[PDB]
Amino acid sequence: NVIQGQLMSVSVPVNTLVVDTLSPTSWQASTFFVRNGSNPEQDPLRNLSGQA
Amino acid sequence: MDIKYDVVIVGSGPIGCTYARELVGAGYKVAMFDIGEIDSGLKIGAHKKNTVEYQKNIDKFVNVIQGQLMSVSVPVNTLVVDTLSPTSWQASTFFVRNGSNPEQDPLRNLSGQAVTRVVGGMSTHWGCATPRFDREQRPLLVKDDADADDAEWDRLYTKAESYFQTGTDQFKESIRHNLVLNKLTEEYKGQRDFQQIPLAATRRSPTFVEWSSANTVFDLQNRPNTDAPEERFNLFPAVACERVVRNALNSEIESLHIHDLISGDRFEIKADVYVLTAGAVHNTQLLVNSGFGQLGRPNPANPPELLPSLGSYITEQSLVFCQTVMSTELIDSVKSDMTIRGTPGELTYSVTYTPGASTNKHPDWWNEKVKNHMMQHQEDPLPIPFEDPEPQVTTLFQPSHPWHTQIHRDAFSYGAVQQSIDSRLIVDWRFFGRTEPKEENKLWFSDKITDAYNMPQPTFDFRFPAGRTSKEAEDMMTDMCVMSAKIGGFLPGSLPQFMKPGLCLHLGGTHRMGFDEKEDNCCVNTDSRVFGFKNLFLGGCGNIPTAYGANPTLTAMSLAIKSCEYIKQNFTPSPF
Amino acid sequence: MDIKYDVVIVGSGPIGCTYARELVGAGYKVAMFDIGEIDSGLKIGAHKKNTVEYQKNIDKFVNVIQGQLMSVSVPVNTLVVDTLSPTSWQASTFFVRNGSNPEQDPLRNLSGQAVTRVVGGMSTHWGCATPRFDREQRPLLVKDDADADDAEWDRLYTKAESYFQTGTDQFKESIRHNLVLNKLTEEYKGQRDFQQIPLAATRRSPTFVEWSSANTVFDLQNRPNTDAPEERFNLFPAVACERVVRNALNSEIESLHIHDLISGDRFEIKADVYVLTAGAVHNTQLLVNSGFGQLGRPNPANPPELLPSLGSYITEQSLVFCQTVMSTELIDSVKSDMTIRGTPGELTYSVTYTPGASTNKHPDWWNEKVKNHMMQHQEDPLPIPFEDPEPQVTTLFQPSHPWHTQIHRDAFSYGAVQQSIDSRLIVDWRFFGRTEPKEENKLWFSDKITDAYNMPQPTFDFRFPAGRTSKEAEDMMTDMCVMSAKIGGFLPGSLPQFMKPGLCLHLGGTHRMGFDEKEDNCCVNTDSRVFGFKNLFLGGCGNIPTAYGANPTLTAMSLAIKSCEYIKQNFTPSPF
Amino acid sequence: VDWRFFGRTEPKEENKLWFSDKITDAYNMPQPTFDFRFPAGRTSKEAEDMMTDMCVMSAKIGGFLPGSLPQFMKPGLCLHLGGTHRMGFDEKEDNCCVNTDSRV
Ligand SMILES: *Cc1cc2c(cc1C)nc1c(=O)[nH]c(=O)nc-1n2C[C@H](O)[C@H](O)[C@H](O)COP(=O)(O)OP(=O)(O)OC[C@H]1O[C@@H](n2cnc3c(N)ncnc32)[C@H](O)[C@@H]1O
Numbered sequence A: 001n002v003i004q005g006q007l008m009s010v011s012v013p014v015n016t017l018v019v020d021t022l023s024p025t026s027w028q029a030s031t032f033f034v035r036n037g038s039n040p041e042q043d044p045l046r047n048l049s050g051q052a
Numbered sequence B, C: 001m002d003i004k005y006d007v008v009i010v011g012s013g014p015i016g017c018t019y020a021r022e023l024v025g026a027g028y029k030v031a032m033f034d035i036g037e038i039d040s041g042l043k044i045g046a047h048k049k050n051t052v053e054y055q056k057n058i059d060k061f062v063n064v065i066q067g068q069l070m071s072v073s074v075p076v077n078t079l080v081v082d083t084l085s086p087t088s089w090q091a092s093t094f095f096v097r098n099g100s101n102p103e104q105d106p107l108r109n110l111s112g113q114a115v116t117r118v119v120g121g122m123s124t125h126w127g128c129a130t131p132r133f134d135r136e137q138r139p140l141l142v143k144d145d146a147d148a149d150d151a152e153w154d155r156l157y158t159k160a161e162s163y164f165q166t167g168t169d170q171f172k173e174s175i176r177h178n179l180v181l182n183k184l185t186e187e188y189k190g191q192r193d194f195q196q197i198p199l200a201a202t203r204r205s206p207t208f209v210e211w212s213s214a215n216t217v218f219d220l221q222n223r224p225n226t227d228a229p230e231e232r233f234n235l236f237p238a239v240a241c242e243r244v245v246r247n248a249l250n251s252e253i254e255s256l257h258i259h260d261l262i263s264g265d266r267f268e269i270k271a272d273v274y275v276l277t278a279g280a281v282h283n284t285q286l287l288v289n290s291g292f293g294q295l296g297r298p299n300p301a302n303p304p305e306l307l308p309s310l311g312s313y314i315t316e317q318s319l320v321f322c323q324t325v326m327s328t329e330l331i332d333s334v335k336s337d338m339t340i341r342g343t344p345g346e347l348t349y350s351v352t353y354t355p356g357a358s359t360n361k362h363p364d365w366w367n368e369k370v371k372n373h374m375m376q377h378q379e380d381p382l383p384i385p386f387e388d389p390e391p392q393v394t395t396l397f398q399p400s401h402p403w404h405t406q407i408h409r410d411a412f413s414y415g416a417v418q419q420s421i422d423s424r425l426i427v428d429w430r431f432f433g434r435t436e437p438k439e440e441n442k443l444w445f446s447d448k449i450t451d452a453y454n455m456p457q458p459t460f461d462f463r464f465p466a467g468r469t470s471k472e473a474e475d476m477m478t479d480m481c482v483m484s485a486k487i488g489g490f491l492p493g494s495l496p497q498f499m500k501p502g503l504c505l506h507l508g509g510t511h512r513m514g515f516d517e518k519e520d521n522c523c524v525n526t527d528s529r530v531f532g533f534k535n536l537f538l539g540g541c542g543n544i545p546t547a548y549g550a551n552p553t554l555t556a557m558s559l560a561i562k563s564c565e566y567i568k569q570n571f572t573p574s575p576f
Numbered sequence D: 001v002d003w004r005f006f007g008r009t010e011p012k013e014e015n016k017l018w019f020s021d022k023i024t025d026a027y028n029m030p031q032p033t034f035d036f037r038f039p040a041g042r043t044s045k046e047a048e049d050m051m052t053d054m055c056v057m058s059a060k061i062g063g064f065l066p067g068s069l070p071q072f073m074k075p076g077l078c079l080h081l082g083g084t085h086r087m088g089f090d091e092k093e094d095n096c097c098v099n100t101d102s103r104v
């Protein structure tokens, strides 16, 4: 837990995971927009995802 | 097989079988085709739960359901796997893979929508709930005369309930059922009414229910036969129906084009009357494949010439689910009439009641089951008999609670930790919302991509409408949270949640009914006859044009019965 | 139903059907009972995968399998749930709940063991692999004459393979199959041989295989009928067989006691010949319920009077599994014969080969499939055609690799992330170990606890034996890791692992065969006749007394064919 | 017992760490971006041979622990990144950034 608490990911690609069980009242974007500190330059297929 | 029939029916689900029942009985020469195969045993199209083994292992039945639900539209998968070995082959993109539909926006889908291709359709696995719709959920059959409209729905629903063997008392001797039913009655006294879910089912013994299906409505045996010597019916399984052929006038259907999946051959079939009962998705696909509506991605710049509302105004219900673990207060109530001496497992242990004691909260029969269970199974800490049937409770949709409710048990795949909880304690909660019909919510068919039967690939463009539909959906969730707490707390792993869109499989409005094609933005009239066409009829939930929360099948069958009255009045059976 | 038959058969799986095929054909008056129901469509007891819908959706078939596998022995669950609401009822102990078996030690179980109660048994869902056993895996039918023993097994296996429609070439036109087969041949040159898994199956088209089943061996239709007018057979589904009644001499069976699950009535059935083919678990249960062996927890202080080796020396195979993702080297090999100009998706793009080029690594037909796929589907990055059949590769058990191997695809439930990998790349690896028979490994039946049919509850006391069995099991895992790496890296989520004990469903030895009851510690002789008894025979994997790694069904059928030779030679059919 | 086997990666010009000219990280510095794949040829063959070697060697000690089965870890979890500002004798000939005294 100490280790994980001090390893900050270098490059996180834009997340395209589909959540389709939100309530109909919840706000949602119509796209997978650059969110949550993701790096839009990053190809998720040519990454070092584990680099921190 | 002959080339010419009086009536042809596409699909062998319960709605096709309603047509078959009515029309074979009226003496028409009838053919029914189904793309799927016979696989329910000797009773063709019967419910798969009606085996002794599923009645003793009911949770295994989830697997039967899942094994015959094939996803309608799966978007291209973009999940990153970055722990492959460096030697494994990988593409540089998320390419169209594994039967995914590239037309599909993963954010405007009914991901949970699925279809069943087997003789008897989805009625080989369904839950058999058959409530009537109240006025608010129901389309008009009579204009400007509410009493006359009620009377007509009553006549039709009554017949439909006979065809399905609908009843409301098959679970009346269940302790668990009565425990839930009574508590909720008491808690909502003067606010809401609770009753048994109306269920298409006949109890055969205390541990066996014969669930109804297509086979209950019509047995699907070829005729003439010894029991029906003057009737004429043939069922042709493993036949993909691909198109109905319109005359140039667009006034009549001239043939049905089929593909025999066993021989591989294609044929045309001729009939006086053509009935499409392939389900809400597949009726639409067949029509669009026959030049109704618009093939391809919607294009308003280019409105279709025939049935422009086809595939628009589609509705699916919102669904919320949880499970509860029965409260201590309620379990203790079960044994309230009992005197208990000594300690379980010893010789002096005694559980007794006074039959007829005026202070008894329960009938003698309930108390006998409980005493006997507690004295026979002294290692068991619960007062509920092991073979006690499940709860089957509803409060039906009303204006002040505009959702359908099922408080019940059906087959479920309990994870390992959930298996730690005694099943007698667990109750499932499913609340179903009504969805406003909106032109923008569409089922359409690709002009380039094809499905597994080489038909135009279905694609959804759906979102739950803003406004009432969404407010009610969230109010429904809150209502399940409030109501469920009266019975027990949530079961870990089955916490309150929205189910993926379309999992409820109550899709409607894809080929909707109304009085007037333009004014009511619809495809069929109140006899389920396709506007413009003399001899084409559509059956099923696709016909329902309203926002409904209740399970739609009974309502669809009712419309089918009306549709067959029109047929009997307007087409003469051939001589035998 | 009559009261008297020439032969009665308990169970309608493939082994019962072998008896039925041989004995109905020999003119005996035959009854077969099965506790399960007809549910494979019109072809009674046929494989459930032989529908068009499962052949287009093969992964859905896992659900069919899981829906008909009922766990034999589930220990009491001790999983702690401590996130219930304080209002929910809870016991203060982990009490016997949810059909758990309190006799069962969770640490000496076959947790993965399960049974199938349906007409046709497990052959309605099985994988159809039918290898022969080599000498090392195989029991003796002839003593002190190895060549004579080989000759006898050859005669019997050859007939069994005819009954099952066993073949080794149904997958020969698969690119994927040949890609795997060839690579592994090359890598083990001079060390091991690879071939197609022998499969009970007939190819009907490039996209449809008719998998064999009980129905292939015998069609299970009542006789006399139009095709077999001088034969006599009745199948009675939904009949629980409970006991065979021994004479006081313990020299003959006098009746079969049955329970009709539909009427609820119990009857006795009389026959000259009694054949038990209910599976390895249920044959044992029936025998113990009839006073063979010992009911209750083993007690050596009190050895049974009849068949003291019944339920001892049980064997189940160890099973290791993984999936791979095909290597880049191998995928590129597929298109080695191709010249490629331009870029995919453009007008100039060209994929060509020179038919007959001496430097071609592949036959023209392979290259035609590949060229056509690459030119027709230029958005697809793989050279393998979409409808290419699966790999079906084996290297059969040998002394230097004493395990059976299947390098293949069968129905599988891929998780969401796994669905991200193109299915054409994925290969399943299943290696099966042989288990030394040990007296201490037992299937026994409770004297107090009962199962869902009110029969004595089965309980296992099993561990994989120390010594060779365990060393080989781990060497097998290492061998799969080494061999699989030649084809590709592991698929995340399907990494190398031991499967729970008994999931392979290859249980043997529960009612084992040998020459001499005491010296060979066994229950039946080489005609599958129960020692002491003139007219009682047992069929199935329970008969196999050796340590085997290969799939046992073909071997069991072979023994059944020998058993019927004895019957035909020793019992006269009644006159018709 | 834990088993961790670590492979060597061939240095390839095409494998890059670069920095965005538009996107910034949490300290307002140019956002790092990788363009990496394990090189074809030796690096990838050895990586798979390494996996097989761990499977073979580990079996001498015991069987795998369920839930910790043999697997490749996500790229870069080992945190042994090298070569981003690599050393050599001659800047052009050795394609490098610092000399053997680590001087730029
Ligand atoms: C699956 C499901 C269904 C369900 C249920 C629970 C589950 C898990 N619970 C419900 C319940 O409690 N109450 C109820 O009212 N609905 C519930 N359902 C849904 C219900 O089963 C369906 O509404 C009902 O069966 C619909 O009936 P219908 O006759 O309209 O349609 P179907 O059963 O899908 O049968 C259609 C058939 O047509 C075939 N087919 C499809 N395409 C073709 C082509 N091209 N050619 C020839 N035949 C075609 C099918 O194979 C099928 O049998």
Ligand SMILES: *Cc1cc2c(cc1C)nc1c(=O)[nH]c(=O)nc-1n2C[C@H](O)[C@H](O)[C@H](O)COP(=O)(O)OP(=O)(O)OC[C@H]1O[C@@H](n2cnc3c(N)ncnc32)[C@H](O)[C@@H]1O
Binding pocket: C010, C011, C012, C013, C014, C015, C016, C033, C034, C035, C036, C065, C116, C117, C118, C119, C120, C121, C122, C123, C125, C126, C127, C128, C129, C130, C239, C240, C241, C242, C277, C278, C279, C280, C282, C286, C505, C539, C540, C541, C551, C552, C553, C554
């Ligand atoms: C389930 C399974 C099976 C399997 C397979 C894969 C799966 C997922 N893959 C295998 C394969 O590739 N090759 C092979 O050799 N084996 C494979 N199998 C196993 C195979 O199906 C079984 O070995 C085979 O079917 C055994 O045949 P048998 O005829 O001995 O037994 P059965 O099929 O279990 O049928 C027994 C029947 O008897 C009934 N029954 C049980 N108890 C009673 C009582 N008391 N009274 C009357 N009937 C009884 C059953 O209901 C059943 O049909």
